[PDB]
Structure 1
Amino acid sequence: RRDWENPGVTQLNRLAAHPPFASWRNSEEARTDRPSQQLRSLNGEWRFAWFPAPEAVPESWLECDLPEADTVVVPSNWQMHGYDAPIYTNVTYPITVNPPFVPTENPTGCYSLTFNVDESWLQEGQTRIIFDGVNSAFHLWCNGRWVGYGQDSRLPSEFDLSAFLRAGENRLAVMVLRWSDGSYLEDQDMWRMSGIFRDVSLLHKPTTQISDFHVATRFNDDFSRAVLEAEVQMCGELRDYLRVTVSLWQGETQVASGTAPFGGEIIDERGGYADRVTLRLNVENPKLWSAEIPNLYRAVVELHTADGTLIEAEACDVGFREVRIENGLLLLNGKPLLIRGVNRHEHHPLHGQVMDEQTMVQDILLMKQNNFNAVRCSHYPNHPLWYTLCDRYGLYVVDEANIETHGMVPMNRLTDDPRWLPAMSERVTRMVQRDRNHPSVIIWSLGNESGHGANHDALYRWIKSVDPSRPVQYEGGGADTTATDIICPMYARVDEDQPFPAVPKWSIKKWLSLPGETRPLILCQYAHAMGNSLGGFAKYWQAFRQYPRLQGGFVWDWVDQSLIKYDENGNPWSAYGGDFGDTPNDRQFCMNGLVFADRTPHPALTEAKHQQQFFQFRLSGQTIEVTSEYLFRHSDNELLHWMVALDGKPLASGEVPLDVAPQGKQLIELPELPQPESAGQLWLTVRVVQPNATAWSEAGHISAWQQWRLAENLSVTLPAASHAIPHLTTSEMDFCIELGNKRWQFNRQSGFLSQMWIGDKKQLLTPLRDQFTRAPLDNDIGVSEATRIDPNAWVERWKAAGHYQAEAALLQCTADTLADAVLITTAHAWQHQGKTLFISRKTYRIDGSGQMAITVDVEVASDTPHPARIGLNCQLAQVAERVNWLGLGPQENYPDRLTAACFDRWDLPLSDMYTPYVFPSENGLRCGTRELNYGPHQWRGDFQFNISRYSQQQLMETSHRHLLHAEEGTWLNIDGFHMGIGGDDSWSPSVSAEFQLSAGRYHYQLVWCQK
């Protein structure tokens, strides 16, 4: 049969889909969500054997274990056990595109399990097996007899084993095909793996059972009254003595209960459903569910007899909330949402695509701690526990069908073809059937990157028809097609249009107002967090706040899809595309997360946290106005802390309880802040602290912050008469300056400061030179590759211009002695293929105090690409333990990504000054720095800097962080100016004009002195 090369066969003998069941036989257990004796896990140790194709599978395997098999844990992806390599390809399918056929060499995983079954399960009722996730298709045999087949790697497949099992020991055999016609619908940008990767279980249900149930909650105009309506269907023999009771509980309190015999209302000329019943329960003043306060009730559905004997019970958590689009706005409980979302793939660096509760809870907690209120299931239905957790912790979810055909040409080749309508419809319909009772799901999505075809239009209407309670979205075909209730583009910029033909990506602000357009706009993916990125994140947030119809978005994405590999000494390291011998591959494009694979945050997460704050502040005089962005709760677990500091030196602070209604404001008068006897800048910092711990945060959690510069007192105080005067020694090749136990040497042919001594100790490993380049970020590189250069990428514009090859030419080097100091003057030109790219003019003035004042004036040819930076650099001979600076921090910050950083005095171990991006590049800059301390040196001025054991050269020559090695000494990069990092996307230049170094002439000055 070759059922795995026929989109017309997506399954054989598979049971209908339905919401999570457990068949409790005790109502209270159902109410409490406790473990059910009728639902057994078959997870654990299985037998497994790998074959290169299904044809190679021995027939004996159906009857008995293969001696060559191994014993492995299930769920798992077999690539993670080393049986074959996982492949990282983004768009291009991992197999030849020739639908619906798959390669003849098709890795086949033969899993088997010998286990026991009690007669009690067989003597009555139905015993089914449930495979929550099998990638990508499989055949199932039980005791050597063929049971059935299933496709869709992301939804459960269940089969009735009642007639196949026997009391005692039984054997399951499952042949899993890596590739199948299902693969053409699974072209998501993620590792391509396979296997039994989600749970396997056995479920026992009575012959007469609850086969489906749907819960709806409708409200009156102000949400002070609701009706809970639960439709219940049965399978089995109808009998008049049968009943269904549906009860609603708020904790231990029973809120409502209704009982009815089967028999629905008349539907049409042939009657109604004799096998269904709908119970309707009124609820006054329901506690409403939202991500702010995830109030939940428990619905218990009991199937029983008139005399009271329970047959079985099913149940679910219920959240009272209405989701609707009106007048162009997405409302939840009648208030317009502001989605602070993120797309999250199911990824574990060691377990591959196998999810576990601990990881899930770790993700959720980090999300809520960082002010996210929503998640999109990019790009398939998730493991079932995820929805339970979103329901209870409180996150709005976009549940998305496992349909992605990105690699087709054109993208809608299959989605517009009716012969693929059935397979696609199963991917949508079965998801809705399984997840429609979860209150956390607020929007359905038809899949991802599959163009726009008529099949999407058919399925969009199917959903709208079956479940009017939730909007339907879909980005394919241009983001605003007839298959979406929400304009949901990916990577559309804030102000800049990208008018691609047929599927233009307009500026979001302009998109909203195109002729005839009225829908809300929520980006399905925005701000690509690959490497050092998130530049321009604030721009989105300012627009979402200013424009009602701009309702937010899902950042791309939560966690890097890096996998762990082990070196020669068995040490682990983070790998990406190509690292398993997979080819073609898309290299580092699999790492786009706000957190690394092991959940440590990237610095960008803090920028997200800050922009997504729920409290806004303005300052006026001594007055602070706090405005709450919560729609439903009062700030009842919040206090405001404030502190006033001069140049990092705290002068005063205090705290004020916050009591602001949702959407309201609170004024807070700060007490008279005394004046200050000292030059410097006074800064006010406020933080919102949650005094009490919550289900997702600890006591003392800071949820928001903001700063303002208050007065500044410029220094007008004259240094003081130098104790001594520096001496200049001139030789043919050098200018030397001596002062006390310090000496500076300037080489007359190079024109740079080549050496500095403190006593007899040399302080430099390489001379102090201008630097106009940076080891390229992922955003600077984009898609450019040696085999296919993208001449438009920043890195290629820089290379081509000669930025990385340009050599300094001396134009001038002079020394003069002044009354109290020595002045060195230098000028250099940087040229390439005879063009002058940059000209740097400087003065060094060394005085009686031993301070060295450096002034730098640079010219940049208007016709060369704007440079990555304009600074100086050097390799210091010293290695010191800490770094202390008065500037923005404490974490890495760049020009277009520094809103979350605060101006203060920070002190960190040197290694915290380096960001271990998997793919190395320029990293760890801190901007807005007035003073920097390292070892006995001190630099003062107004600059940006980074300091670490790695040279730019090394970072730009190294592709994996595990291969970097500390160089002798410390590399110090001190910049007058640094280009933004961008990140709107990572494949097209995205650094905003206001963040490019295009002024033509730049000036900066620093004072180097000994401390």
Structure 2
Amino acid sequence: VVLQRRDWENPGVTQLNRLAAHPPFASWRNSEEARTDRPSQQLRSLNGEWRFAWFPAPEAVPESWLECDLPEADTVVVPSNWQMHGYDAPIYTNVTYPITVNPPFVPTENPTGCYSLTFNVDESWLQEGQTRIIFDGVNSAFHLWCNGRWVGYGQDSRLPSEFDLSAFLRAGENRLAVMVLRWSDGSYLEDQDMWRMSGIFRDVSLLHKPTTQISDFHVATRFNDDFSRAVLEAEVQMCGELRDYLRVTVSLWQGETQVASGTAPFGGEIIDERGGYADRVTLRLNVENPKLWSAEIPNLYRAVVELHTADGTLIEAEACDVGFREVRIENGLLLLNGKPLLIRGVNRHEHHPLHGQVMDEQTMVQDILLMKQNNFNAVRCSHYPNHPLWYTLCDRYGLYVVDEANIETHGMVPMNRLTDDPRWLPAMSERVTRMVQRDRNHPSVIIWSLGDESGHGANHDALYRWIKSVDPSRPVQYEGGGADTTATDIICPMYARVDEDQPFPAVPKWSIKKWLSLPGETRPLILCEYAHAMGNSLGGFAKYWQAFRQYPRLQGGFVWDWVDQSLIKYDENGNPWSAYGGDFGDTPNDRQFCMNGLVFADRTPHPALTEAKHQQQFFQFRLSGQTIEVTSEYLFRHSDNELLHWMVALDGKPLASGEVPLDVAPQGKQLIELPELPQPESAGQLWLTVRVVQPNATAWSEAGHISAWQQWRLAENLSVTLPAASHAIPHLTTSEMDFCIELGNKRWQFNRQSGFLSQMWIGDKKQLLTPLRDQFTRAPLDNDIGVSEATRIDPNAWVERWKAAGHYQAEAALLQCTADTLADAVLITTAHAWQHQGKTLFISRKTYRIDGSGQMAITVDVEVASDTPHPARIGLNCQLAQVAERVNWLGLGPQENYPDRLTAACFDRWDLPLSDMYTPYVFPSENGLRCGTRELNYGPHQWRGDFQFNISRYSQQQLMETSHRHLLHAEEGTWLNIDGFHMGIGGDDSWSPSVSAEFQLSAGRYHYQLVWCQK
């Protein structure tokens, strides 16, 4: 029957014998246990060691497996994805389905995971009541047997499937058999951009419920106009025999204090001409001055639902955390507790580099702590309902949640092919309805989403209305079909730009500022995805935040995304390395597109994380004379754990500092008068840095946590006094091939054939391994590459424009190399042209002035042909012979920063180990740049000027030729790139050019100057 019906190739069959969905149950038989959320004796975990065998197709599964352990099976940990155990390959594909698009059929070769468990059941569980099994997540479809007998079937990889095992179990030892199919008709609705894995990847548990039981309960909280009064309404449903002596009590607790209680027999109010629900009752509790829930202050109450008899005998209790909050859209603004939210959000996939798609509490906690520490207040469940514990943690730690249905059909042509088809309405409805039934009591969930990237079909409209009808307490959003359809309360585009329209036919992405004011449009706009953080990215992040702050109806967005989806593989030395698409023999694949995170897979931050934290600050600052104005962007909390630290420094040298307690009301202002600052000793620029410091530890942060900062230039005293003229004078030695300059122990060598400084000597020690030459290219970032590949070039991508113009292979042709002796210096003058097939791309004109103090002043003037694509950089590079431990600089830092991603960086004196000046992006590229640098120190060398630089053991050549960071090898010496100018990195998306015009090197003529000396 099972192999004959092929339920996994029929979208009409999404389950067999599956129980109704409901909120989290534990069936406590003690009310105090329910109140305190202590473990329940009636809820057992079946996680641990199971038996597992892999088969290529369900037809290959032997019948004996139903009754007897297979001797060829292995003992494996559950929950798990079987790809993470090495049984077959995980597949990384973005849009294109991993299977032939032929709905509702899947491949005949359909990897089949045969799980089994021998376990014990207490006799008391079978003597009364109902024993069910709960599978929180099975990917993608499964049949279940118990003691050899068939129980049921389930689809939807991201919601729990529950089955009554009461009739199947015996006292003592029992054996479960679970046949998990990798592919099913459900796979057509699970085309999310992520690793395609399978298995029993979430918790398995057993729940005992009494025969007479709470089968569902819904908790609603409504408020008066100023939120000083609330009514809690709890609808409770039962199954079992109705008796007049049955009662429901709902009690509400604030900590140890019961604040309200109500008791009633079953029997709901009249609904229609046939009466009401005899199996339901609704309790209403008054609450004066409720403590309100927000991400700022996650006040929670506990609601306990007791099923009992009139004489007082408890039958069972269920419970949940209650957060008193109202979510509503009014006058085009999303309001929480009457105040307009500013969503500092991120999209978060459930990903672990070792365990795949199996989530654990420790990883979830680490994510939430890192999010809150970096000024995020919201998370989108991209693109499926999460592990149940996620919502509990968001309730308790305080994050706003977008809960999203497990529906994505991105690879269909057109995208709405299934979602507009009524044949698929049943399968889609269950993914929406069962999510709402599970998650509706969680205060952290503020918005429902209909799924992701499935076009706009009539099924979306039906399901949109279904939610609006069942749950009026939360807006519904959905991006498909152009982000502003009739199926969304919120304009929720993905990667719409701040100022630039992208008028794609049918589904345009308007500038977000322009989108708001389109004729007739009144809704709020919150980007469901923006700032694609792929590799070296988040260029232009500050532009979004400026606009979010300026425009009331631009209420923020969710960054794409939290964590890189890299996976651990092991090399010959057994060393773990980070793997992406294709590294498992998976083909077709989408290579490094699985890595878009603000953090590495192990939760180490990318440099971009600090840019997000700074732009998402909850305190804004202005300076006027001696006065600092601090504005709070909190809606509910006073600044009761904040002090402002201020510091004034002269080019990195501290001059004065101080502390002032912050006492600011939500949305209020505080004026801080800085004391009269002493006059600086010498020339230079004074800089003011302020930081907001949290003195006290919280649930989400340590004592001394920095939550906000800002810098200003104060007074500058320009240096007018000439240094004392040195007595030494450099000597020019002219030969046919070289111009040499000597000054005591030091010597400079300019090759007359090449026109470059080819060597320098301090004593008899050589300083260079490669000559000092102009550089106009970079190892291409992911944003430079986009979707371009060797097999399918995207001629519009930055990397391809540079390649085709000859930027990477242009040869320096010497035009001029002269030497002159000045009164106190030797002057070398050079001119080079870079050409590709008869075309002059760049001209570089330089002077090198070496004086008696041993300083070499370099002046560079570059011409760039207006009709060549704007170059990635205008600078100099060389390979130094020196390898030194430390890098010391006066400039923006301490972390990596680029021209369109440097707002988080501060100007100061920074000192780091050399390894910190390299950013280990899994896909290697130009990295580690620091901008606005006036002084750089490395070993015996000092460079002064106004430049950007990176410094590492890897050439640009090696970085661009190496696909994986673990394959990089430190070269001899140290590669130095010093740029007068550097192009933006972009990142509004990573599939089209995204570097804004103002960060492109289009001026045509460029000037910079450096001084190279010994410090």
Aligned-residue offset at 1:825: 0.2
Match of 1:812 in 2: 816
User: Alignment partner of 1:79: what SS?
Assistant: coil
Q: C-alpha distance in 2, partners of 1:877/1:522?
A: 52
Q: C-alpha distance in 1, partners of 2:861/2:724?
A: 28
Over the matched positions of the two proteins, sequence identity in percent amounts to 100
Number of residue pairs aligned between Structure 1 and Structure 2:
1011
User: Alignment partner of 1:267: what SS?
Assistant: strand
Match of 2:189 in 1: 185
Q: C-alpha distance in 2, partners of 1:979/1:621?
A: 34
In the alignment, does 2:499 pair up with 1:509?
no
In the alignment, does 2:885 pair up with 1:881?
yes
User: Alignment partner of 2:84: what SS?
Assistant: helix
Aligned-residue offset at 1:366: 0.1
Give CA deviations for 1:187-233 in whole Å, capped at 9, x if unaligned. Answer: 00000000000000000000000000000000000000000000000
Match of 2:971 in 1: 967
Q: C-alpha distance in 2, partners of 1:722/1:443?
A: 72
Give CA deviations for 1:897-944 in whole Å, capped at 9, x if unaligned. Answer: 000000000000000000000000000000000000000100000000
User: Alignment partner of 2:83: what SS?
Assistant: helix
Match of 1:478 in 2: 482
Aligned-residue offset at 1:261: 0.4
Q: C-alpha distance in 2, partners of 1:168/1:358?
A: 33
Q: C-alpha distance in 1, partners of 2:119/2:134?
A: 15
Give CA deviations for 1:505-528 in whole Å, capped at 9, x if unaligned. Answer: 000000000010000000000000
Aligned-residue offset at 1:719: 1.5
Q: Which of the numbers 109, 125, 132 marks the counterpart of 1:121?
A: 125
Gaps of 5+ in 1: none
Aligned-residue offset at 1:875: 0.1
Q: C-alpha distance in 2, partners of 1:1010/1:648?
A: 20
User: Alignment partner of 1:984: what SS?
Assistant: coil
Aligned-residue offset at 1:665: 0.2
Q: C-alpha distance in 1, partners of 2:210/2:489?
A: 41
Q: How does 1:1-16 map to 2 (within 5 A)?
A: 1-16=5-20
Match of 2:635 in 1: 631
Aligned-residue offset at 1:59: 0.2
Q: C-alpha distance in 1, partners of 2:85/2:848?
A: 62
Q: Which of the numbers 590, 596, 608 marks the counterpart of 1:592?
A: 596
Aligned-residue offset at 1:677: 2.1
Match of 1:390 in 2: 394
In the alignment, does 2:333 pair up with 1:329?
yes
Q: C-alpha distance in 2, partners of 1:781/1:1005?
A: 31
Aligned-residue offset at 1:795: 0.1
Q: What's the Cα RMSD here? A: 0.3
Instruction: Report the TM-score, using the length of structure 1 for normalisation.
Output: 1.00
Q: C-alpha distance in 2, partners of 1:718/1:287?
A: 67
In the alignment, does 2:378 pair up with 1:374?
yes
Q: C-alpha distance in 1, partners of 2:943/2:744?
A: 20
Aligned-residue offset at 1:120: 0.3
Match of 2:686 in 1: 682
User: Alignment partner of 2:272: what SS?
Assistant: coil
Match of 1:727 in 2: 731
Give CA deviations for 1:918-972 in whole Å, capped at 9, x if unaligned. Answer: 0000000000000000001000000000000000000000000000000000000
User: Alignment partner of 2:772: what SS?
Assistant: strand
Give CA deviations for 1:523-567 in whole Å, capped at 9, x if unaligned. Answer: 000000000000000000000000000000000000000000000
Q: C-alpha distance in 2, partners of 1:271/1:757?
A: 99
Q: C-alpha distance in 2, partners of 1:677/1:245?
A: 75
Give CA deviations for 1:647-702 in whole Å, capped at 9, x if unaligned. Answer: 00000000000000000000000000111121110000000000000000000000
Q: C-alpha distance in 2, partners of 1:721/1:947?
A: 32
Give CA deviations for 1:240-272 in whole Å, capped at 9, x if unaligned. Answer: 000000000000001000000000000000000
Q: C-alpha distance in 2, partners of 1:61/1:717?
A: 91
User: Alignment partner of 2:521: what SS?
Assistant: coil
Q: C-alpha distance in 1, partners of 2:679/2:406?
A: 63
Give CA deviations for 1:758-791 in whole Å, capped at 9, x if unaligned. Answer: 0000000000000000000000000000000000
Aligned-residue offset at 1:458: 0.0
Q: Which of the numbers 780, 784, 787 marks the counterpart of 2:791?
A: 787
Q: How does 1:345-744 map to 2 (within 5 A)?
A: 345-744=349-748
Aligned-residue offset at 1:721: 1.7
User: Alignment partner of 2:461: what SS?
Assistant: helix
User: Alignment partner of 1:80: what SS?
Assistant: coil
Aligned-residue offset at 1:645: 0.1
Q: C-alpha distance in 1, partners of 2:201/2:936?
A: 51
Gaps of 5+ in 2: none
Aligned-residue offset at 1:621: 0.3
User: Alignment partner of 1:461: what SS?
Assistant: helix
Give CA deviations for 1:454-512 in whole Å, capped at 9, x if unaligned. Answer: 00000000000000000000000000000000000000000000000000000000000
Aligned-residue offset at 1:124: 0.2
Q: C-alpha distance in 2, partners of 1:100/1:319?
A: 42
Instruction: Report the TM-score, using the length of structure 2 for normalisation.
Output: 1.00
Aligned-residue offset at 1:723: 2.1
Aligned-residue offset at 1:755: 0.2
Q: C-alpha distance in 2, partners of 1:168/1:629?
A: 59
Q: C-alpha distance in 1, partners of 2:970/2:296?
A: 46
User: Alignment partner of 1:704: what SS?
Assistant: strand
Q: C-alpha distance in 1, partners of 2:677/2:289?
A: 47
Q: C-alpha distance in 1, partners of 2:757/2:157?
A: 63
Give CA deviations for 1:783-835 in whole Å, capped at 9, x if unaligned. Answer: 00000000000000000000000000000000000000000000000001110
Q: C-alpha distance in 2, partners of 1:794/1:145?
A: 61
Match of 1:101 in 2: 105
User: Alignment partner of 1:589: what SS?
Assistant: helix
Give CA deviations for 1:836-859 in whole Å, capped at 9, x if unaligned. Answer: 000000000000111000000000
In the alignment, does 2:862 pair up with 1:858?
yes
User: Alignment partner of 1:78: what SS?
Assistant: coil
Q: C-alpha distance in 2, partners of 1:730/1:850?
A: 19
Aligned-residue offset at 1:40: 0.1
Once the two structures are overlaid, the 10-residue window that deviates more, 715-724 or 822-831, is 715-724
Give CA deviations for 1:112-151 in whole Å, capped at 9, x if unaligned. Answer: 0001111100000000000000000000000000000000
In the alignment, does 2:156 pair up with 1:152?
yes
Aligned-residue offset at 1:740: 1.4
Q: C-alpha distance in 2, partners of 1:51/1:721?
A: 84
Aligned-residue offset at 1:437: 0.1
Q: C-alpha distance in 2, partners of 1:457/1:739?
A: 81
Give CA deviations for 1:279-311 in whole Å, capped at 9, x if unaligned. Answer: 000000000000000000000000000000000
Q: C-alpha distance in 2, partners of 1:754/1:415?
A: 65
User: Alignment partner of 2:691: what SS?
Assistant: strand
Q: C-alpha distance in 2, partners of 1:396/1:708?
A: 33
Q: C-alpha distance in 1, partners of 2:531/2:648?
A: 34
Q: C-alpha distance in 2, partners of 1:670/1:636?
A: 21
User: Alignment partner of 1:605: what SS?
Assistant: helix
Q: C-alpha distance in 2, partners of 1:143/1:677?
A: 87
Aligned-residue offset at 1:354: 0.1
User: Alignment partner of 1:362: what SS?
Assistant: helix
Q: C-alpha distance in 1, partners of 2:73/2:725?
A: 86
Aligned-residue offset at 1:391: 0.2
Aligned-residue offset at 1:720: 1.2
User: Alignment partner of 2:238: what SS?
Assistant: strand
Q: C-alpha distance in 2, partners of 1:430/1:410?
A: 27
Q: C-alpha distance in 2, partners of 1:523/1:76?
A: 33
Q: C-alpha distance in 2, partners of 1:667/1:741?
A: 58
Q: C-alpha distance in 2, partners of 1:723/1:377?
A: 70
Q: How does 1:286-365 map to 2 (within 5 A)?
A: 286-365=290-369
Q: C-alpha distance in 2, partners of 1:971/1:713?
A: 35
Q: C-alpha distance in 1, partners of 2:395/2:657?
A: 39
In the alignment, does 2:980 pair up with 1:976?
yes
Q: C-alpha distance in 1, partners of 2:387/2:674?
A: 50
Q: C-alpha distance in 2, partners of 1:39/1:784?
A: 52
Q: C-alpha distance in 2, partners of 1:383/1:967?
A: 45
